[PDB]
Amino acid sequence: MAIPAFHPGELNVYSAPGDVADVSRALRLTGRRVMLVPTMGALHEGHLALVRAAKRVPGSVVVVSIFVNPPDDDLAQLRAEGVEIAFTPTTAAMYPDGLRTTVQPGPLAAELEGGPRPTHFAGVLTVVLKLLQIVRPDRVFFGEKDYQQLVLIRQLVADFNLDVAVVGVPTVREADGLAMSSRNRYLDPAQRAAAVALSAALTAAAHAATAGAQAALDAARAVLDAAPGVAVDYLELRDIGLGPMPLNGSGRLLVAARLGTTRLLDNIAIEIG
Amino acid sequence: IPAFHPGELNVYSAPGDVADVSRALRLTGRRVMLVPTMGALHEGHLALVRAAKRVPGSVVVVSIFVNPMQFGAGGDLDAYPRTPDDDLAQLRAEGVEIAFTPTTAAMYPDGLRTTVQPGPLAAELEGGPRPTHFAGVLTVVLKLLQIVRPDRVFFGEKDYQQLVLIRQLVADFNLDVAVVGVPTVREADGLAMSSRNRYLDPAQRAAAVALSAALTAAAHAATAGAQAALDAARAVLDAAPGVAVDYLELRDIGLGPMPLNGSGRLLVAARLGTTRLLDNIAIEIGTFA
Ligand SMILES: COc1ccc2c(c1)cc(C(=O)NS(=O)(=O)c1ccc(C)cc1)n2CC(=O)O
Ligand SMILES: COc1ccc2c(c1)cc(C(=O)NS(=O)(=O)c1ccc(C)cc1)n2CC(=O)O
Ligand SMILES: COc1ccc2c(c1)cc(C(=O)NS(=O)(=O)c1ccc(C)cc1)n2CC(=O)O
């Protein structure tokens, strides 16, 4: 009946869904705007950019979930950013009845990433929906790196009439443009040097786009063709919702490739002509 | 937020209208109760409404929407009874303050896209021959719950499988609503209320009492064990003219992957002519009875 302990301006950690739910509700009732940054831990500058984006909403309290969908470092990083709530549930707490009711994505989940991994997105949309129901944030923050994921989440939100604002945060990148990812550490020196071709192809495309869609795609393809040991799985230009690219106007160019055993993805905004 | 006149029936079609009114009410302290229906309201629906009105400080939202996504090709969707005039008349007589009557286009502007995939219970019983039926039902109920954000939502027990799956949806997606099951309202002879009873001719209406007679016979027979309970119900169904049984099954109360213990639910579905009737009852086995 009592709200769990919450100390404002400190890092409060909760592993019970009902605790975080009760604290988030208590906080909402006192005025604060609840922001949710979902993560799977092993925090990097990309997650800090989602945190900083959430923190700048006036009156924000920031909830960072850390949950590996089937430590003290992460928490210290959150402490240093001024985050007030970490939600760190067990698999059992998230799934106390096992896998049962789930989210079935629309047919977009079968395209692109959904080729190698036909059910990956059902799993992501299920846990995102649960996290949104537990935390009930006013706004939820994702990076743009996994753009198809982001689009699928906006579809989830629209389709199930969720009241939350979905905020996409521009992808944080290394100095040479490589998109931040937990996988970059695995690249040896030759793979890491080759991997800059994804971001270089996409920026080349976004600039070639004054010359039209084919010039853009041909520019990206040429840059990827200049890289050794980059096995391109797809290179597609779509509209911003990931339907077919309209004759001109706004679009998104997406790429994925395998370098040795590591799969990399990147995407960029494209304006046609 | 549009107009809300209290102590009157306010009808909203736009999801955003009822969402705004609901959230404003909740913030001024009223607890919001949802009774989701497919219209063609009968006294069983009025019992749901009365249950909801009984919650202190309640405001009652009754939704009316014949959801196309739970029907499969065939004439079933076109055939569903629609009596909107009667429906709204009844809600006013019960003192309901909000009816939410959305259009199909306002519910499904993008057609069918993201959906709820129920657990394996949805492929059994009523779902065996209708493999997407319960995905359709839970998808609309999820939407209704997110639009209205009620404190409690009320269902009849007559569609007991559906109520169980709804409890699963609420648990599995950490929804912040209480699910309230209300005991089935019956005609004087025991027949479960249903917007499909209008399709029984006089002979079928007479024979239809067999379902509820079979179930209560089984619940009293149950002191002698599950076989006796099942056999009593089967005997009554067999004695009845023109009743074709589709299934008669005794299950644990969650209908889930656990054997029957002391407490069960006995479920029956049968066709009288073209009309499929359902009914169910609580069963206590042996000492529990
Ligand atoms: C704003 O800049 C960025 C740049 C890259 C990002 C992120 C942000 C976030 C991620 C990432 O995938 N985070 S996550 O594994 O913790 C994650 C996976 C799935 C969901 C729905 C949310 C977060 N990543 C990529 C990654 O870590 O592999
Ligand atoms: C408390 O007493 C009862 C008794 C029977 C009831 C009810 C209440 C409610 C229904 C019913 O089917 N209502 S409904 O078609 O509008 C309906 C269908 C599906 C959902 C999820 C909610 C309501 N029915 C069954 C019916 O009309 O067949
Ligand atoms: C066991 O036999 C069947 C037969 C048809 C089935 C299924 C099973 C399962 C589906 C299915 O999930 N179809 S769907 O993703 O387009 C869908 C999901 C939800 C609803 C309410 C309707 C369709 N469907 C429809 C299909 O694949 O088009």
Author numbering:
A (entry chain B): 1 to 70, 86 to 288
B (entry chain A): 3 to 291
Text taken from the publication that reported this structure:
Herein, we describe the use of GE to optimize a fragment‐derived inhibitor of Mycobacterium tuberculosis pantothenate synthetase, an attractive target for developing new drugs against tuberculosis. Pantothenate synthetase catalyzes the ATP‐dependent formation of an amide bond between pantoate and β‐alanine. The work presented here demonstrates the use of GE analysis to critically and thoroughly examine the binding distribution of a lead compound and illustrates the practicality of applying GE analysis to modify parts of a molecule that are not making efficient contributions to binding.
Based on these observations, the initial optimization strategy was focused on replacement of the methyl pyridine and the benzofuran groups rather than the acyl sulfonamide linker in both compounds 5 and 8. Compounds were designed with the objective of optimizing interactions at the P1 or P2 sites of panthothenate synthetase. Consequently, 1‐ethyl‐3‐(3‐dimethylaminopropyl)‐carbodiimide (EDCI)‐mediated coupling reactions were employed to generate a series of indole acyl sulfonamide compounds (10–19; the syntheses are described in the Supporting Information). In order to establish this, the structures of the four most potent inhibitors (10–13) bound to the enzyme were solved using protein X‐ray crystallography. Less obviously, the substituted groups on all four compounds were seen to bind in the P1 pocket of the enzyme.
